[PDB]
């Protein structure tokens, strides 16, 4: 409780309000608010792994995960679908994958040409500190 | 810009026989067997301000189509040239294995990846595998590095340039009976920077000019160097695919038709380069 | 191969004046202004099967220490060599400008990145920013690319090769007074693959082997493409930063002191390439 309570969230980049996490042709990308269930993520603390899993409300047997190419993915449940969030300011988090890649952590990251992310896929890339703008994502309601 | 504006075949490092090839009906790019065809070819365009290249297909009935990572998906396709960020690429020579990583200007964390199973192109993040590494090479030296073929004059074909017999060499023009003395294996030599023309009827036997005879041409066993042996193939850009076989010993010496006689028996000779037409020739699959 | 066993300076494309530097008291690496000292030299070792290169600092005191990605941090240091995966690097050359993005063999996902606020080296994921891109060069070309300096034989370090005055354009040896006729500027013409020596009391007055009265040598207006102006600078490679100055026109004619003569006014000529001392020189800041 208090900290990321189970429920239905929206997921943005700090690079722009007015854009939401959504799946498209099987990638995850930030897109224009559609007020629909495609953009609503159900996030569930699983106390057995002290980590959280995140399902897509409109296809809720599919969870956020990643592939052996860089990308974050929607997939059926897997240990990869487990995430270990770090809050660093109201509603903003740096999502680390629970299980470490080599000796170093990875995170959701998203590229910006100039604080612009329009057509960009969400990927999984090494993390280091709390100071990477791209690694930062905000989860509301 | 070192190779800028060049015409090129990209093949996969994880499969030497697979080429970037554009599929006629629409805009798929696919990894395909060797093809000696415009569809196999791509010219590279540098942009000084974007500091990066785009890759354009020489599809003749679909000009101005270029390699294009589709917005957020994993998919590489060919597209109408908006001339946008998704349509540019950084070319990165590996220097170790001498191949290229091709990374998207749009987001250069992601790189071209060869999906060998399902024979199309995809994106992946950087790693050491050979799925992200690629061979880029001069369309001509690719089409001719090891091509076993027949040669026909620009003047009406098929009459093919052949050696007369396994027993007797020389070199004549004839109508295409399939006898392998008319089948002709051309193989590139990086060091010399030129191609030899082997005969099949007996390998080790290669197409040669002669010394103390200038016009005359024949076949002989390979020798050091040898300067007389070896040749330079050069296209004549247009709808084209018609080439010009030029000797290394004397660069003004081009393979000639001896007045372009169009009948069986004719000597094949070698001349100065004014041509043009007996000098010109095309080459193709048995 | 290509850059194997070669010996090199790395400078940041984001800021040309800062180079990779191995701070001498124990192992760190800093981005630091141009030195011309072993400190900013790095030997490039290839591992043909590892697929990738490692970069070894040339510090005399602590040889066999290389450039090395620290653990799960983003920092980068000079450390003892043990062929560990941290210690290798992919040298991916951008073909647009002739830059290099240098990626970790242990983890390509991220490549090294010039900090330049903290004069420092870290690892970051990729981008189009010039902070991840770098300039790799033969140290000799980097040292004598463009170098305002004084030239001295090894037989007399306190004495200096000079033009005699602004009017009298001959070249002798003289004790170092900080006067302009004693200072030169060395420039690489890369297309020519050789350097010229510009004297500093003259604009475009250049060290020349005047081939006609030769072996004598003096300064002349630069002219165009004389080819007796222009010189190669080769070290005596194992040790001491001492260079033979060989002439372009004639391979076996180098800069010469004319007997180990050492005394004010002694001639500087150009002579047959023998053992040395006579033939060796040393370049250094005014």
XYZ file of C-alpha atoms in Angstrom:
713
model
C 0.000 0.000 0.000
C 0.969 3.650 -0.325
C 3.646 2.521 -2.726
C 2.322 1.439 -6.110
C -0.964 -0.044 -4.901
C -2.413 -2.745 -7.156
C -4.704 -1.464 -9.887
C -5.231 0.110 -13.282
C -2.641 2.657 -14.392
C -1.685 4.805 -17.364
C 2.003 4.808 -18.313
C 3.868 7.767 -19.821
C 7.330 9.094 -20.534
C 8.341 12.160 -18.566
C 9.170 13.576 -21.991
C 5.487 14.355 -22.640
C 2.104 14.197 -20.916
C -0.456 13.740 -23.667
C 1.105 10.442 -24.696
C 0.379 6.991 -23.279
C 1.945 3.556 -23.426
C 0.189 1.435 -26.012
C 0.937 -1.717 -28.063
C 0.987 -1.466 -31.844
C 1.962 -4.051 -34.444
C 3.391 -5.888 -31.409
C 5.748 -3.230 -30.116
C 5.203 -0.961 -27.219
C 5.169 2.744 -28.065
C 3.796 5.974 -26.657
C 0.691 7.251 -28.515
C -2.186 9.791 -28.414
C -4.697 9.452 -25.569
C -7.505 7.131 -26.853
C -9.431 6.827 -23.539
C -9.769 3.136 -24.381
C -8.754 -0.088 -22.615
C -5.875 -0.614 -24.986
C -3.875 1.976 -22.964
C -4.753 0.849 -19.408
C -2.251 -1.315 -17.561
C -3.157 -3.531 -14.613
C -0.180 -3.699 -12.206
C -0.005 -6.430 -9.583
C 2.455 -6.794 -6.714
C 3.363 -10.467 -6.449
C 4.642 -10.929 -2.910
C 6.284 -14.251 -3.706
C 9.008 -12.523 -5.821
C 8.786 -9.074 -4.199
C 8.213 -7.550 -7.596
C 5.339 -6.456 -9.837
C 3.809 -7.859 -13.027
C 1.927 -5.649 -15.480
C -0.926 -6.925 -17.692
C -2.738 -5.087 -20.515
C -6.319 -4.590 -19.447
C -7.805 -5.116 -22.903
C -5.846 -8.394 -23.382
C -5.327 -9.240 -19.713
C -3.654 -12.640 -20.226
C -0.769 -10.747 -21.835
C 1.877 -9.076 -19.686
C 4.729 -6.618 -20.307
C 7.961 -8.467 -20.971
C 10.968 -8.426 -23.328
C 12.532 -10.365 -26.246
C 16.069 -11.381 -27.297
C 16.199 -8.323 -29.488
C 16.117 -5.119 -27.461
C 12.366 -4.539 -27.237
C 9.873 -4.549 -24.409
C 7.023 -6.916 -25.381
C 3.458 -8.059 -24.666
C 3.674 -11.859 -23.929
C 2.066 -14.639 -21.896
C 3.437 -14.874 -18.386
C 7.152 -15.516 -17.895
C 9.830 -14.650 -15.280
C 10.787 -11.855 -17.701
C 7.347 -10.305 -17.122
C 8.515 -9.481 -13.533
C 9.588 -5.904 -12.800
C 11.170 -4.139 -9.820
C 10.042 -0.465 -9.807
C 12.037 2.403 -8.290
C 10.038 5.542 -7.444
C 12.108 8.715 -7.737
C 9.394 11.386 -7.556
C 5.617 11.622 -7.420
C 4.315 9.027 -9.818
C 7.570 8.526 -11.696
C 9.458 5.228 -11.694
C 12.460 3.529 -13.235
C 11.389 0.014 -14.105
C 14.168 -2.494 -13.669
C 13.878 -6.131 -14.703
C 14.031 -8.164 -11.498
C 16.476 -10.696 -12.892
C 19.767 -9.046 -13.820
C 21.152 -9.401 -17.375
C 24.885 -10.064 -16.815
C 25.949 -8.399 -13.579
C 24.047 -5.229 -14.486
C 20.458 -4.124 -14.361
C 18.276 -3.295 -17.323
C 15.373 -0.944 -17.610
C 12.627 0.296 -19.740
C 14.224 3.034 -21.812
C 12.939 5.135 -24.687
C 14.910 7.153 -27.261
C 14.311 10.863 -27.937
C 15.436 12.782 -30.992
C 14.853 15.959 -29.021
C 12.582 15.167 -26.118
C 10.384 13.772 -28.875
C 9.467 10.119 -28.795
C 6.719 9.948 -31.341
C 7.331 6.823 -33.283
C 9.731 5.206 -30.768
C 9.580 1.623 -29.445
C 10.139 0.984 -25.748
C 13.262 -1.095 -25.218
C 15.193 -2.706 -22.434
C 18.637 -1.170 -21.860
C 21.284 -1.129 -19.199
C 20.660 1.048 -16.171
C 23.187 2.789 -13.964
C 21.720 5.531 -11.714
C 18.426 7.458 -11.197
C 19.552 10.287 -13.366
C 18.677 8.995 -16.871
C 15.724 10.930 -18.291
C 14.866 8.150 -20.786
C 14.685 5.387 -18.150
C 12.107 7.554 -16.231
C 8.366 6.685 -16.670
C 5.286 7.850 -14.880
C 2.375 5.666 -13.745
C -0.904 7.366 -12.767
C -4.267 6.261 -11.231
C 30.636 9.378 -48.495
C 33.616 7.215 -49.394
C 31.303 4.855 -51.257
C 28.519 7.406 -51.665
C 26.290 7.102 -54.721
C 27.626 3.588 -55.272
C 25.524 0.664 -56.490
C 25.711 -2.314 -54.175
C 24.671 -5.776 -52.940
C 24.173 -6.267 -49.233
C 24.409 -9.889 -48.108
C 24.074 -11.475 -44.660
C 27.197 -12.416 -42.710
C 25.293 -15.360 -41.164
C 24.567 -16.658 -44.670
C 26.883 -15.688 -47.532
C 24.293 -16.857 -50.117
C 21.520 -14.501 -48.894
C 21.037 -11.036 -50.276
C 18.916 -8.024 -49.471
C 16.369 -8.279 -52.294
C 13.181 -6.255 -52.887
C 9.964 -8.200 -53.661
C 8.247 -7.018 -56.853
C 4.512 -6.998 -55.983
C 4.754 -4.473 -53.170
C 7.292 -3.210 -50.646
C 8.719 -6.159 -48.819
C 12.432 -6.563 -48.539
C 13.589 -10.112 -48.167
C 16.726 -12.151 -47.779
C 17.025 -14.043 -51.062
C 19.375 -16.287 -53.012
C 21.878 -14.640 -55.355
C 20.119 -13.177 -58.397
C 22.407 -10.930 -60.630
C 19.442 -8.621 -60.844
C 18.407 -5.024 -60.314
C 16.198 -6.261 -57.388
C 19.358 -7.444 -55.596
C 20.873 -3.965 -55.906
C 20.840 -0.861 -53.777
C 22.545 2.530 -54.237
C 23.783 4.348 -51.191
C 23.082 8.023 -50.674
C 24.962 10.166 -48.141
C 23.497 13.212 -46.446
C 26.049 15.662 -45.150
C 23.677 17.230 -42.617
C 22.226 13.988 -41.253
C 25.707 12.502 -41.423
C 24.132 9.263 -42.468
C 23.177 7.171 -45.465
C 19.947 6.006 -47.040
C 19.629 2.813 -49.115
C 17.721 2.972 -52.468
C 16.473 0.008 -54.540
C 17.286 -0.022 -58.212
C 13.959 -1.648 -59.009
C 13.536 -0.194 -62.489
C 9.690 -0.295 -62.588
C 9.697 1.101 -59.043
C 12.308 3.834 -58.775
C 12.689 6.001 -55.697
C 12.076 3.197 -53.227
C 14.328 3.065 -50.169
C 14.936 0.860 -47.065
C 12.726 1.963 -44.204
C 12.218 0.950 -40.579
C 8.510 1.211 -39.875
C 7.782 3.618 -37.054
C 7.619 1.493 -33.893
C 7.380 -2.048 -35.257
C 10.222 -4.519 -35.827
C 9.772 -4.361 -39.588
C 12.147 -3.299 -42.324
C 10.391 -2.639 -45.597
C 10.969 -0.653 -48.795
C 9.227 2.711 -49.049
C 8.427 5.751 -51.025
C 11.237 8.242 -50.207
C 9.656 10.819 -47.863
C 13.323 11.392 -47.038
C 12.634 11.040 -43.368
C 14.565 9.890 -40.296
C 13.241 6.297 -40.467
C 14.707 6.157 -43.970
C 18.324 6.900 -42.911
C 21.032 4.594 -41.553
C 24.543 4.810 -40.142
C 26.938 2.467 -41.957
C 29.438 1.024 -39.505
C 32.447 -0.990 -40.721
C 33.579 -3.523 -38.056
C 37.231 -3.410 -39.018
C 37.710 -6.791 -37.271
C 35.646 -8.948 -39.652
C 35.399 -6.126 -42.246
C 31.561 -6.155 -42.414
C 28.938 -3.586 -41.510
C 26.499 -2.972 -38.761
C 23.601 -0.943 -40.110
C 21.902 1.182 -37.451
C 18.836 3.371 -37.762
C 19.399 7.089 -37.702
C 15.888 7.234 -36.230
C 17.039 5.426 -33.186
C 20.597 4.159 -33.624
C 20.347 1.856 -30.637
C 18.572 -0.508 -33.049
C 20.260 -2.229 -35.894
C 19.344 -4.329 -38.943
C 18.965 -7.996 -38.044
C 18.818 -10.938 -40.456
C 15.850 -13.214 -39.746
C 17.164 -16.222 -41.555
C 14.301 -18.522 -40.613
C 11.563 -16.434 -42.225
C 13.819 -14.660 -44.704
C 13.031 -10.978 -44.027
C 14.819 -8.120 -42.240
C 14.253 -7.120 -38.640
C 15.719 -4.891 -35.913
C 17.793 -5.827 -32.939
C 19.837 -4.062 -30.342
C 23.711 -4.285 -30.539
C 25.476 -7.600 -29.901
C 28.185 -9.749 -31.385
C 26.057 -12.135 -33.449
C 26.283 -12.323 -37.199
C 22.631 -11.577 -37.605
C 23.411 -7.838 -37.195
C 26.636 -7.900 -39.305
C 26.455 -7.550 -43.164
C 28.606 -7.685 -46.309
C 28.393 -4.588 -48.541
C 30.011 -4.876 -52.007
C 30.236 -3.499 -55.590
C 27.306 -4.911 -57.576
C 29.701 -5.872 -60.339
C 32.333 -7.579 -58.246
C 29.426 -9.336 -56.422
C 27.805 -10.438 -59.689
C 31.209 -11.585 -61.048
C 33.284 -12.776 -58.051
C 32.389 -16.371 -59.010
C 29.868 -16.613 -61.875
C 29.839 -19.539 -64.301
C 28.157 -18.264 -67.473
C 27.921 -17.720 -71.264
C 28.991 -14.522 -73.032
C 27.006 -13.042 -75.943
C 27.742 -9.936 -78.041
C 25.439 -6.930 -77.914
C 24.793 -7.858 -81.520
C 22.095 -10.441 -81.720
C 22.275 -13.391 -79.365
C 22.573 -16.073 -78.451
C 25.797 -16.703 -80.244
C 28.293 -17.287 -77.489
C 32.020 -16.714 -77.162
C 33.684 -20.179 -76.859
C 36.975 -22.072 -77.188
C 36.879 -24.452 -80.186
C 37.731 -27.740 -78.474
C 39.072 -29.418 -75.383
C 41.847 -30.587 -77.688
C 42.151 -27.260 -79.494
C 41.738 -23.865 -77.900
C 41.801 -20.565 -79.725
C 38.492 -18.728 -79.396
C 35.548 -18.367 -81.782
C 31.939 -17.153 -81.946
C 29.164 -19.757 -82.486
C 25.429 -20.468 -82.055
C 24.564 -21.806 -78.578
C 24.899 -25.539 -78.574
C 25.252 -26.339 -74.845
C 28.690 -28.052 -75.058
C 30.639 -26.911 -72.013
C 33.446 -25.463 -74.169
C 30.842 -22.605 -74.499
C 30.372 -22.446 -70.688
C 32.781 -20.018 -69.149
C 33.639 -19.523 -65.392
C 34.529 -15.995 -64.312
C 36.190 -15.494 -60.898
C 37.562 -12.291 -59.252
C 41.020 -11.619 -57.866
C 41.056 -8.965 -55.135
C 44.863 -8.620 -55.195
C 45.224 -7.887 -58.951
C 41.839 -6.057 -58.870
C 40.632 -7.987 -61.953
C 38.729 -11.078 -63.109
C 39.984 -14.153 -65.003
C 37.713 -15.968 -67.504
C 38.179 -19.755 -67.014
C 36.911 -22.333 -69.477
C 34.987 -25.318 -68.133
C 35.951 -27.942 -70.771
C 39.268 -28.068 -68.892
C 39.797 -26.030 -65.700
C 43.147 -24.252 -65.096
C 42.661 -23.019 -68.722
C 41.882 -19.284 -68.850
C 41.105 -16.639 -71.452
C 44.189 -14.737 -72.530
C 45.411 -12.136 -75.001
C 48.827 -12.835 -76.505
C 52.202 -11.187 -76.916
C 53.782 -10.862 -80.365
C 50.205 -11.048 -81.569
C 48.126 -8.065 -80.513
C 44.682 -8.527 -82.022
C 44.638 -12.286 -81.541
C 43.155 -13.840 -78.410
C 43.161 -17.446 -77.131
C 43.204 -19.622 -73.945
C 46.179 -20.662 -71.798
C 47.164 -22.125 -68.449
C 47.427 -19.564 -65.663
C 50.894 -18.105 -65.159
C 52.669 -15.427 -63.151
C 51.788 -12.718 -63.076
C 50.401 -12.869 -65.495
C 49.717 -9.385 -66.838
C 48.240 -10.511 -70.147
C 45.768 -12.653 -68.242
C 42.949 -11.035 -66.237
C 40.308 -8.531 -67.257
C 38.295 -5.545 -66.132
C 34.480 -5.696 -66.403
C 32.716 -2.331 -66.656
C 29.008 -1.668 -67.184
C 27.342 1.096 -69.224
C 24.694 2.509 -66.897
C 21.162 2.787 -68.188
C 18.599 0.009 -68.220
C 21.945 -1.550 -69.059
C 23.520 -4.709 -67.587
C 25.710 -4.703 -70.682
C 29.408 -4.824 -69.906
C 32.844 -4.021 -71.379
C 35.632 -6.597 -71.039
C 38.976 -4.700 -70.863
C 42.480 -6.233 -70.519
C 44.788 -5.320 -67.605
C 48.131 -5.330 -69.503
C 46.898 -2.470 -71.708
C 43.832 -0.559 -70.444
C 42.982 0.670 -73.990
C 42.636 -2.995 -75.093
C 38.948 -4.044 -75.091
C 37.419 -7.396 -76.184
C 36.360 -6.840 -79.784
C 34.195 -8.429 -82.451
C 36.592 -8.018 -85.363
C 34.157 -5.739 -87.160
C 31.288 -7.322 -85.313
C 30.772 -10.087 -87.813
C 27.551 -11.829 -86.778
C 28.206 -15.367 -88.168
C 29.611 -18.701 -86.903
C 33.440 -19.115 -86.728
C 34.328 -15.387 -86.403
C 37.603 -14.539 -84.558
C 37.108 -12.558 -81.295
C 40.316 -10.476 -81.267
C 40.960 -7.370 -79.062
C 41.086 -3.638 -80.047
C 41.134 0.045 -79.039
C 38.014 1.170 -77.261
C 36.088 3.295 -79.720
C 33.577 0.539 -80.303
C 30.821 0.619 -79.590
C 28.956 -2.589 -80.084
C 31.221 -5.359 -81.168
C 33.227 -4.293 -78.141
C 30.099 -4.521 -75.971
C 28.835 -7.819 -74.536
C 26.414 -9.392 -72.039
C 26.692 -12.467 -69.880
C 24.155 -14.891 -68.518
C 23.247 -18.308 -67.064
C 23.814 -21.444 -69.162
C 44.574 -6.881 -38.936
C 44.248 -3.278 -40.357
C 45.121 -1.349 -37.112
C 46.719 -4.377 -35.414
C 49.801 -3.667 -33.325
C 49.433 -0.056 -34.471
C 50.057 2.860 -32.171
C 47.584 5.563 -31.807
C 45.940 8.680 -30.277
C 42.233 8.837 -29.574
C 40.538 12.259 -29.365
C 36.888 13.130 -28.802
C 34.868 14.090 -31.836
C 32.759 16.212 -29.493
C 35.824 18.322 -28.636
C 38.877 17.992 -30.836
C 41.444 19.341 -28.356
C 40.882 16.617 -25.699
C 42.546 13.240 -26.004
C 42.567 9.989 -24.130
C 45.103 10.364 -21.330
C 46.428 7.819 -18.796
C 47.042 9.813 -15.586
C 50.423 8.523 -14.538
C 49.984 7.966 -10.767
C 48.045 4.661 -10.798
C 45.228 3.882 -13.298
C 42.630 6.399 -14.425
C 41.908 7.732 -17.843
C 41.042 11.349 -18.433
C 40.140 13.441 -21.411
C 43.001 15.848 -21.512
C 44.458 18.531 -23.750
C 47.081 17.642 -26.374
C 50.395 16.413 -24.938
C 52.781 14.675 -27.318
C 53.731 12.119 -24.739
C 53.366 8.374 -24.432
C 50.556 9.242 -21.947
C 48.154 9.969 -24.855
C 49.429 7.052 -27.004
C 47.602 3.716 -27.065
C 48.630 0.440 -28.731
C 45.828 -1.380 -30.492
C 45.889 -5.153 -30.040
C 43.652 -7.493 -32.067
C 42.268 -10.841 -31.005
C 41.473 -12.465 -34.320
C 39.198 -15.013 -32.699
C 37.739 -12.759 -29.937
C 36.527 -10.698 -32.885
C 37.583 -7.463 -31.234
C 40.354 -5.102 -30.177
C 41.901 -3.946 -26.922
C 43.565 -0.648 -26.255
C 46.778 -0.621 -24.215
C 48.348 2.537 -22.678
C 51.908 3.284 -23.576
C 53.038 4.557 -20.199
C 56.686 3.591 -19.875
C 56.493 3.059 -16.138
C 53.489 0.751 -16.261
C 53.331 -1.119 -19.540
C 50.767 -3.812 -20.225
C 47.829 -1.921 -18.755
C 44.718 -1.407 -20.900
C 41.490 0.528 -21.262
C 38.845 -1.247 -19.243
C 35.105 -1.018 -18.404
C 34.568 -1.150 -14.699
C 32.237 -3.772 -13.341
C 28.526 -2.843 -13.340
C 29.291 0.923 -12.997
C 29.590 3.120 -16.066
C 33.204 4.178 -15.416
C 36.265 3.488 -17.487
C 39.874 3.058 -16.393
C 43.353 1.857 -17.177
C 43.924 -1.528 -15.537
C 46.109 -4.626 -15.578
C 45.774 -6.691 -18.781
C 44.174 -10.121 -18.555
C 42.159 -10.429 -21.791
C 39.007 -10.142 -19.727
C 35.853 -9.355 -21.575
C 35.667 -5.872 -19.899
C 39.009 -5.169 -21.516
C 37.868 -5.646 -25.182
C 36.142 -3.319 -27.635
C 34.535 -3.309 -31.052
C 35.965 -0.591 -33.264
C 33.002 0.340 -35.401
C 34.021 3.010 -37.928
C 31.396 5.426 -39.164
C 31.887 5.783 -42.864
C 30.324 9.317 -43.114
C 33.106 11.232 -41.394
C 35.941 8.845 -40.540
C 34.958 8.590 -36.861
C 34.725 5.611 -34.572
C 32.066 4.481 -32.117
C 33.829 2.143 -29.709
C 31.549 -0.481 -28.132
C 32.218 -2.916 -25.275
C 32.891 -6.472 -26.360
C 31.522 -7.613 -23.018
C 28.353 -5.649 -23.754
C 27.780 -3.976 -27.117
C 24.422 -2.591 -25.916
C 26.618 0.285 -24.655
C 29.574 2.234 -26.026
C 32.004 4.704 -24.569
C 31.237 8.338 -24.279
C 33.353 11.422 -23.735
C 32.178 13.435 -20.735
C 34.017 16.783 -21.215
C 32.383 18.456 -18.255
C 34.445 16.185 -15.993
C 37.144 15.484 -18.596
C 36.305 11.813 -18.287
C 35.178 8.512 -19.996
C 31.919 6.580 -19.350
C 29.637 4.047 -21.050
C 26.218 5.021 -22.443
C 23.635 3.633 -24.773
C 23.806 5.022 -28.309
C 22.635 8.213 -30.004
C 23.519 10.608 -32.794
C 25.383 12.885 -30.342
C 29.090 13.287 -31.008
C 30.008 12.309 -27.466
C 29.992 8.581 -28.324
C 32.042 9.147 -31.524
C 35.887 9.390 -31.601
C 38.987 10.047 -33.699
C 41.684 7.376 -34.005
C 45.069 8.262 -35.555
C 48.694 7.232 -36.028
C 50.428 9.175 -33.249
C 53.030 10.548 -35.614
C 50.339 12.051 -37.834
C 48.640 13.367 -34.684
C 51.840 14.856 -33.359
C 53.040 16.410 -36.635
C 49.596 17.138 -38.164
C 49.965 20.831 -37.371
C 52.811 21.563 -34.965
C 54.502 24.812 -34.158
C 57.802 23.580 -32.809
C 61.602 23.857 -32.678
C 63.861 21.264 -34.394
C 67.148 20.062 -32.869
C 69.712 17.338 -33.699
C 70.373 14.683 -31.056
C 74.011 15.721 -30.947
C 72.985 19.193 -29.657
C 69.565 19.549 -27.968
C 70.205 23.142 -26.937
C 70.939 24.036 -30.575
C 68.450 24.331 -33.349
C 67.862 24.028 -37.092
C 67.041 27.520 -38.430
C 66.588 29.778 -41.402
C 69.408 32.367 -40.898
C 67.194 35.455 -41.260
C 64.143 36.864 -43.043
C 66.307 37.927 -45.999
C 69.003 35.190 -45.984
C 67.049 31.988 -46.627
C 69.735 29.401 -45.904
C 69.398 26.792 -43.200
C 72.058 26.257 -40.579
C 72.316 25.141 -36.955
C 72.262 27.738 -34.197
C 71.947 28.046 -30.427
C 68.288 28.504 -29.422
C 67.267 32.081 -29.049
C 63.461 32.268 -29.147
C 63.636 34.132 -32.486
C 61.121 33.303 -35.259
C 63.684 32.169 -37.796
C 64.252 29.297 -35.283
C 60.608 28.168 -34.901
C 58.824 26.018 -37.571
C 55.218 24.858 -38.170
C 54.786 21.305 -39.409
C 51.751 20.499 -41.563
C 50.434 17.210 -43.016
C 49.141 17.177 -46.540
C 47.259 13.895 -46.300
C 46.463 13.633 -49.990
C 50.295 13.835 -50.511
C 50.893 11.509 -47.491
C 53.861 13.697 -46.445
C 54.497 16.734 -44.230
C 55.851 20.277 -44.929
C 57.933 22.572 -42.677
C 56.814 26.222 -42.666
C 59.278 28.737 -41.230
C 57.754 31.311 -38.940
C 59.389 34.593 -40.126
C 57.856 33.821 -43.552
C 54.297 33.018 -44.604
C 54.459 30.064 -47.034
C 58.243 29.740 -46.770
C 58.976 26.038 -46.626
C 61.910 23.699 -45.956
C 63.139 22.559 -49.375
C 65.732 20.232 -50.907
C 66.705 22.399 -53.893
C 67.622 19.413 -56.081
C 69.800 21.327 -58.551
C 72.634 22.584 -56.293
C 71.793 19.627 -53.945
C 72.928 18.260 -51.494
C 72.303 21.837 -50.247
C 68.893 22.775 -48.762
C 67.117 26.036 -47.891
C 63.729 27.761 -47.697
C 61.684 28.654 -50.759
C 58.250 29.988 -51.591
C 55.910 27.054 -51.298
C 55.178 26.899 -55.003
C 53.032 24.034 -56.208
C 53.793 20.335 -55.868
C 57.579 20.599 -55.955
C 57.806 17.175 -54.343
C 61.231 17.929 -52.922
C 59.376 20.011 -50.346
C 57.337 17.480 -48.319
C 59.037 14.952 -46.041
C 58.234 11.810 -44.077
C 58.710 11.650 -40.336
C 59.617 8.144 -39.165
C 60.651 7.353 -35.624
C 63.406 5.004 -34.607
C 60.391 2.944 -33.485
C 61.408 0.986 -30.388
C 62.547 4.053 -28.444
C 62.917 7.731 -27.656
C 60.587 9.791 -29.859
C 63.435 10.500 -32.275
C 62.611 10.882 -35.945
C 64.463 10.574 -39.244
C 63.305 13.253 -41.685
C 63.256 11.573 -45.146
C 62.539 13.508 -48.383
C 59.720 12.684 -50.813
C 61.488 13.078 -54.163
C 64.277 10.699 -53.037
C 63.612 7.937 -50.502
C 67.330 7.616 -49.556
C 68.009 11.326 -49.126
C 67.279 12.499 -45.553
C 67.947 15.608 -43.463
C 71.671 15.717 -42.528
C 73.910 17.664 -40.141
C 77.218 17.339 -42.166
C 79.608 15.702 -39.700
C 78.558 15.663 -36.031
C 79.548 19.268 -36.313
C 77.445 20.838 -33.590
C 78.750 24.411 -33.931
C 76.919 27.668 -34.669
C 76.457 28.144 -38.423
C 77.040 24.407 -39.216
C 75.154 23.508 -42.382
C 71.985 21.469 -42.524
C 72.017 19.604 -45.862
C 70.436 16.402 -47.134
C 72.431 13.186 -47.433
C 72.563 9.428 -48.072
C 70.676 7.504 -45.408
C 73.332 6.024 -43.072
C 73.154 4.645 -39.513
C 72.535 7.998 -37.841
C 73.047 10.476 -35.007
C 74.018 12.695 -37.930
C 70.610 11.778 -39.456
C 68.383 11.754 -36.329
C 66.441 14.831 -35.113
C 64.039 15.773 -32.312
C 60.910 17.963 -32.457
C 59.527 19.764 -29.420
C 57.532 22.801 -28.215
C 58.975 26.316 -28.156
